[PDB]
Amino acid sequence: PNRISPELLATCGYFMPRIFFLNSQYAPQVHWGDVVAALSHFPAGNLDLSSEEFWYEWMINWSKVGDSYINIANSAKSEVSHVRALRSAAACYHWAEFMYFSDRSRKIQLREYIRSCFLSSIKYSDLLVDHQYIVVDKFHMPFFLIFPKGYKEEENHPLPCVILSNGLDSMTEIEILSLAEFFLGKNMAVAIFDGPGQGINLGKSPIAIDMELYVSSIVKLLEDDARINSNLLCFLGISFGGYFALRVAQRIGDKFCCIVNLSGGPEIAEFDKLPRRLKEDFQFAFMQDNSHMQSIFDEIKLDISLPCKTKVFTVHGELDDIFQIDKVKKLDQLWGDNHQLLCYESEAHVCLNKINEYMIQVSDWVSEQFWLNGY
Amino acid sequence: PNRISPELLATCGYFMPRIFFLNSQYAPQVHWGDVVAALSHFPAGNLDLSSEEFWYEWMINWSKVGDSYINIANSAKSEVSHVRALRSAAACYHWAEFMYFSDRSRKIQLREYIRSCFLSSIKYSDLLVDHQYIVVDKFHMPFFLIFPKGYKEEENHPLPCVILSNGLDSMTEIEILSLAEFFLGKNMAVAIFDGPGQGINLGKSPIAIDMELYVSSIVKLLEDDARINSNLLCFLGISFGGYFALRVAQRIGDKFCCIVNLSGGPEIAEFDKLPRRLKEDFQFAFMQDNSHMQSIFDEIKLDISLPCKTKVFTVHGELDDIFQIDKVKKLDQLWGDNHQLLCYESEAHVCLNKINEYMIQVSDWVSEQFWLNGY
């Protein structure tokens, strides 16, 4: 009788709300049965979330479930069945790779699988997806402008647009598309992208600390696009993307009606004491070894005395062990009326037990900021 | 740090794939965080799935999460936020009630909450819902005819239609609407209904063993409806609804191109030895005490020598402890070429670890049967 062991389900408690994430219409999402398929035959005596051996077995077991869905997709008798299977495969391949850093080529291969599933699927979607490369100096940035259900240029005024950034270990068409659906559902356009070291670029180029440079290039594209009202822009970042949201607020905040920070902070906890696989996660994203990472963290740290140039909404957990709440509250106090803090008392990083609730509130808050700017 | 205890998550292993069910667009569905909200403060030393005390605490704790979503719904700043919250509340209230039988009025109240959320929400849906009462003698049967996304009479030929039946403890707009989306996605109409002792009628009227009488009245409505091709009908039943699917196959199978039996069987295991809360579940549905139930089970038992009058697809688990696999395999052998059996080796009742996979296969099989009948 196939089931997950209690020792394993307990061990993975922190990641279960991440793996299930948001109930979505378009974004790939696992079923409970996919988690059972992955973990039912997971080797015993292997329960250390900080161990390389754990995440190797995680990667190969989730890869098997992804493979099974590709086989279903290849044998599917309808386009609707084909796309459902491709979406399930993409979700499985994402959870295979997201905390696996030991084989750079294998991790990149798994993200290529996901992007292939996404690009293949767009054809069958009822949403208009405008996909292109934005050239930022010599960097060719993958970019997706997505319009709401049943959108037509001719029967619409220029739309508000939300730009959403990846965190360190998110995939654009998984977590970020999931968040983006809350804005698509409110008849807003969304802009999702792969900056350096983000999405398909993770393990190819180092993550850019100054991601606001790349966001500036997106803003210029949206200004030029007749379908988008560039006076009704929002920037949302999740996890390390929330750190980028705070940078955007300081540097190019005047371009935005409002900015959403989902559990980003102005500085990261001490690198050497980071729990789980976070050291290897940060190392992989920055393409740097252990010995260089604290120096990067010191460089990352924001000057919070530099003001944010727009309205900011931060969602943060009291028990966040990456972006410590004391630093976020200091920023909230100093940034004053322009910064609103929703703090969940017993929530860890990204408050994922509350994500349905807070994304309802966040999406209505963004709508309200556009309305305040005369939409 | 709010989380579910390992002892509880292990105990509930059987029900976790039921509670998460299918990733749906319209059907209410819980998030992982909803399960945490319900079970994080669940009283310790209370881990008996057969105990009345367990399901009381389950009901009050899930009721709290439902209440929280109604509060979000009442304060929602948009219609899209309002409907998302109503859907989340409905899912929570369903898991509060589905295995709770000790207060008839409270259980009926919770199903009224769900139906109120559903009827309130239809207004905001992009699907055409034709809701009415079908009069069967003196019984007024709640009935929902739902058309595919962007359906218009004038640009469509008469559609195929799938009639879906509840199991003993399902709710029409939760599990059955979830299944129905697989057929709506293939541009088929779906017919979902509350027969005696089903959906909103559970605890009001006893469940009708001869549910095919009520299905006959649906078939007549679909024959009369210009929008439906009554020569392209399917009947699907899940759990005890699958038992009804086998009855429909024997009595009025000629009305159907094909019938789907999701883990129904021709007879039930011995009543006195039923595990978990199944005795109280069957007692509540039939509105009968313990002493009368085995007699009803003896009456329920099908004459498998009576042939099925159409093509039948059964999905069954080898380890099903309600509809034993030996009885299903005997039926498969006797019904011969007209019956196909998909048997999952290590699956319990309804094979819920496989439901995404098998509903892809089932939906394509139904499409194929309509095609064979010249669609």
Domains of chain A with CATH codes: 6-121 (1.20.1440), 126-372 (3.40.50.1820)
CA distance A282 to A230: 33
Q: Are A177 and A30 in contact (CB under 8 A)?
A: no
Tell me which amino acid residue B177 is. Answer: L
Does B33 contact A352 at a Cβ distance shorter than 8 Å? yes
Q: Are B370 and B189 in contact (CB under 8 A)?
A: no
With vertex at residue B353, the alpha carbon angle to CA B347 and CA B359, rounded to the nearest 5 degrees, is 105
Exposure string for B294-320, b = 16+ CB within 10 A, e = fewer? eebbeebebebeeebbbbbbbbbbbeb
Give A191's strand partners.
A145, A163
Q: Are B98 and B171 in contact (CB under 8 A)?
A: yes
Which of B31, B60, B212 has the alpha carbon at shortest distance from A22?
B31
Q: What share of chain B is helix, strand, coil (3-state, %, to 5)?
A: 50, 15, 35
| Contact A372/B at CB under 8 A | no
Q: Are A179 and A164 in contact (CB under 8 A)?
A: yes
- Give the DSSP H/E element, type plus range, for residue A105: helix A104-122
B8: how many CB neighbours lie within 10 A of its CB?
A: 17
CA distance B245 to B18: 21
CA distance A353 to A14: 10
3-state DSSP of B190-213: EEEECCCCCHHHCCCCCCCCCCHH
Q: Are B37 and B64 in contact (CB under 8 A)?
A: yes
User: In the sheet that A311-317 helps form, which strands lie side by side, from edge to edge?
Assistant: A129-136, A139-146, A189-193, A159-165, A228-238, A258-262, A311-317, A339-344
Does A2 contact B347 at a Cβ distance shorter than 8 Å? yes
Q: Are A148 and A184 in contact (CB under 8 A)?
A: yes
Tell me which amino acid residue A126 is. Answer: D
For residue B338, the 8-state DSSP code is G
Give the position of tokens 């509540």: B284
Distance of residue B247 Cα from the nearest chain A Cα, in angstroms: 29
Pairing of strands A258-262, A228-238: parallel
B78 vs A16, A347, A364: nearest CB: A364
Q: Which residues of B touch A12 (CB under 8 A)?
A: none
Q: Write out the two tokens for B229.
A: 């091709």
Does B88 contact A356 at a Cβ distance shorter than 8 Å? yes
Per the rule left: phi > 0, alpha: psi between -120 and 50, beta: everything else, A174 is alpha
Q: Write out the two tokens for A196.
A: 């350096």
Supply the angle between the helices A290-300 and A278-286 in degrees, to the nearest 10: 80
CA distance B99 to B42: 16
Residues with Cβ within 8 Å of B29's Cβ and at least 6 positions away in sequence, in order, are A23, B20, B21, B22, B23, B87, B91, B178
Tell me which amino acid residue A358 is. Answer: Y
Phi, psi of A192 (to 5 degrees): -115, 150
CA distance B172 to B131: 13
Residue A104 to residues A280, A284, A286, A294, B52, Cα–Cα distance (Å): 12, 8, 13, 22, 53
Q: Are B192 and B176 in contact (CB under 8 A)?
A: yes
Does A85 contact B1 at a Cβ distance shorter than 8 Å? no
| Contact A77/B at CB under 8 A | yes
What are the strands, taking DSSP E only, across A112-188? 129-136, 139-146, 159-165
Distance of residue B71 Cα from the nearest chain A Cα, in angstroms: 11
Experimentally, the structure was elucidated by: X-ray
Q: Write out the two tokens for A67.
A: 């493979």
| Contact A1/B at CB under 8 A | yes
Phi, psi of B312 (to 5 degrees): -120, 130
Using the Cα atoms of residue A331, residue A268, residue A139 and residue A89 in order, give the sign of their dihedral.
negative
Does B356 contact A1 at a Cβ distance shorter than 8 Å? no
Which of B91, B27, B21 has the alpha carbon at shortest distance from B355?
B21
Q: Pseudo-torsion of CA A355, A361, A363, A364, nearest 10°?
A: 170
Give B193's strand partners.
B143
SS3 A61: helix
Which of B230, B229, B265 has the alpha carbon at shortest distance from B245?
B265
Q: Are A167 and A225 in contact (CB under 8 A)?
A: no
- Resolution, Å (one decimal): 1.5
SS3 A162: strand
Q: How many residues does chain B have?
A: 375
CA distance B375 to B367: 9
CA distance A363 to A369: 10
Helices within A233-324 (DSSP H only): 240-251, 278-286, 290-300
CA distance A218 to A244: 14
Give A233's strand partners.
A161
CA distance B46 to B11: 10
Tell me which amino acid residue B336 is. Answer: G
B334: how many CB neighbours lie within 10 A of its CB?
A: 14
Please state the separation of Cα A332 from the chain's center in Å: 23
CA distance B166 to A344: 39
B53: how many CB neighbours lie within 10 A of its CB?
A: 11
| Contact B293/A at CB under 8 A | no
Does B76 contact A364 at a Cβ distance shorter than 8 Å? yes
Q: Are A76 and A117 in contact (CB under 8 A)?
A: no
Using the Cα atoms of residue B286, residue B292, residue B297 and residue B303 in order, give the sign of their dihedral.
negative
What are the strands, taking DSSP E only, across B249-364? 258-262, 311-317, 339-344
Q: Are A91 and B367 in contact (CB under 8 A)?
A: no
Q: Are B41 and B61 in contact (CB under 8 A)?
A: yes
Which of B208, B185, B207, B182 has the alpha carbon at shortest distance from B358?
B182
| Contact A369/B at CB under 8 A | no
Supply the angle between the helices A104-122 and A52-75 in degrees, to the nearest 10: 30
Exposure string for A9-24, b = 16+ CB within 10 A, e = fewer? bbbbbbbbbbbbbbbb
SS3 B228: strand
Please state the separation of Cα B81 from the chain's center in Å: 26
Q: Are B28 and B90 in contact (CB under 8 A)?
A: yes
Residues with Cβ within 8 Å of A118's Cβ and at least 6 positions away in sequence, in order, are A90, A172, A173
Using the Cα atoms of residue B292, residue B295, residue B301 and residue B303 in order, give the sign of their dihedral.
negative
CA distance A352 to B35: 12
Own/partner long-range contacts of B105-114 (Cβ < 8 Å, ≥24 apart)? B106/B59, B107/B202, B107/B203, B107/B284, B108/B202, B108/B203, B108/B204, B110/B59, B110/B63, B111/B171, B111/B199, B111/B200, B111/B202, B111/B203, B112/B200, B113/B66, B113/B89, B114/B28, B114/B90, B114/B171, B114/B173, B114/B174
SS3 A311: strand
Q: Are A238 and A168 in contact (CB under 8 A)?
A: no
CA distance B190 to B183: 7
Q: Which residues of B touch A83 (CB under 8 A)?
A: none
Q: Which residues of B touch A357 (CB under 8 A)?
A: 33, 68, 72
Residue B197 to residues B167, B193, B202, B205, B345, Cα–Cα distance (Å): 10, 11, 4, 5, 32
Q: Are A221 and A214 in contact (CB under 8 A)?
A: no
Distance of residue A144 Cα from the nearest chain B Cα, in angstroms: 23
Please state the separation of Cα B70 from the chain's center in Å: 24
| Contact A25/B at CB under 8 A | yes
Which of A112, A60, A121 has the alpha carbon at shortest distance from A87?
A121
Which of A271, A232, A275 has the alpha carbon at shortest distance from A99?
A275
Which of B127, B175, B155, B144 has the alpha carbon at shortest distance from B24?
B175
Which residues 150-169 of chain A have a CB within 8 Å of chain B? 150
Q: Are B354 and B348 in contact (CB under 8 A)?
A: no
CA distance A143 to B174: 37
CA distance A102 to B129: 52
Q: Write out the two tokens for A195.
A: 């900056």
What are the strands, taking DSSP E only, across B239-298? 258-262
Q: Write out the two tokens for A312.
A: 């900011």
Residue B340 burial (CB < 10 Å; 0-12/13-18/19+)?
middle
Tell me how many residue pairs between chain A and chain B have CB atoms under 8 A apart. Answer: 128
With vertex at residue B363, the alpha carbon angle to CA B361 and CA B369, rounded to the nearest 5 degrees, is 100
